[PDB]
DNA sequence: TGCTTCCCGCGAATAACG
DNA sequence: CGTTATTCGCGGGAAGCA
């Protein structure tokens, strides 16, 4: 196979055969296991780099386009990702975006073609 | 030690299937 | 096209880096 299961207290866990990492969702183990197999490739469409997860490539490509999707709603500054946005708000505004903040806006991705969540443009 | 990347549960978007 | 199976964007913590 590619995993085995483990059950404690009815809780079902899926364990990677290779590194023994534990997953609550089989789809997550599948997502993860590509790291070992490289069955699927995700090549950057701007340079040579290849990635083993779709999202690693996506985040990498955002760096190529320089799009800044995360905007601080307190002062208007924009950031390329959640982490810089959160870092900013905690440091400059002494507030936490965690949970439902209403402190930042995530703009739709426009600088390349990725699946669009409807909630991002209402 | 302040960035930077890596990770995984969750659930919306969509591809596969019949 | 209707169901379901699959993909992968998202949050936000953890791990890595130099
Ligand atoms: Cl922008
Ligand atoms: Zn593994
Ligand atoms: Zn690239
Ligand atoms: Zn701000």
Q: What is the 3-state secondary structure (H, E, C) of A35-91?
A: HHHCCCCEECCCCCCEECCHHHHHHHHHHHHCCCCEEECCCCCEECCHHHHHHHHHH
Take residue A94 and report the two structure tokens written for it.
């002494």
Strands of A78-79's sheet, edge to edge?
A: A78-79, A70-72, A104-106
3-state secondary structure of A95: coil
Spatial contact of A1 and A36, defined as CB atoms under 8 Å apart: no
Closest ligand, as measured to the CA of A91: 4
Identify how the structure was determined: X-ray
Take residue A98 and report the two structure tokens written for it.
């965690």
Q: Which residues pair with A43 in a beta bridge?
A: A50
Q: Which residues pair with A15 in a beta bridge?
A: A4, A22
Give the residue carrying structure tokens 């810089």. A84
Measured from the CB, is A83 under 7 Å from any atom of strand B? yes
Write down all domains in chain A, each with its CATH number in brackets: 1-39 (3.30.160.60), 40-67 (3.30.160.60), 68-107 (3.30.160.60)
- Determine the Cα–Cα distance for residues A49 and A26; give it in Å rounded to an integer: 27
CA of A14 to the centre of ligand 3 (A): 32
What's the CA–C1' distance between A82 and B15, in Å?
Answer: 29
* Closest CA-bearing residue to C1' of B4: A83
Of A81, A55, A56, the closest CA to residue A68 belongs to A81
Q: How many CB atoms lie within 10 A of CB A115?
A: 7
- Cα distances from A33 to residues A16, A27, A48, in angstroms, run 7, 10, 22
Cα angle for residues A60, A111, A79 (degrees, 5° grid): 65
Burial pattern A76-100, b for ≥16 Cβ within 10 A else e, equals ebbbbeeeebbebbeeeeeeebeee
- Cα distances from A2 to residues A10, A24, A28, A31, A35, in angstroms, run 22, 15, 13, 12, 12
Take residue A62 and report the two structure tokens written for it.
């955002």
Tell me the torsion sign for CA atoms A54, A60, A63, A64: negative
Residues in chain A: 122
* Closest CA-bearing residue to C1' of B12: A117
Nucleotide nearest to A14 (CA to C1'): B8
């Amino acid at each position: 196979d590619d995993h085995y299961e483990l059950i404690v207290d009815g809780r079902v866990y899926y364990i990677c055969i290779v590194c023994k990492r534990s997953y609550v969702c089989l789809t997550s183990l599948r997502r993860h296991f590509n790291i070992h197999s490289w069955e699927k490739k995700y090549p950057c469409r701007y340079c040579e780099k290849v990635f083993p997860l779709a999202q690693y490539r996506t985040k990498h490509e955002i760096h190529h386009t320089g799009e800044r999707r995360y905007q601080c709603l307190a002062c208007g500054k924009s950031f390329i990702n959640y982490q810089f946005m959160s870092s900013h708000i905690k440091s400059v505004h002494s507030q936490d975006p965690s949970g439902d903040s209403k402190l930042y806006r995530l703009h739709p991705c426009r600088s390349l073609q990725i699946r669009q969540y409807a909630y991002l443009s209402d």
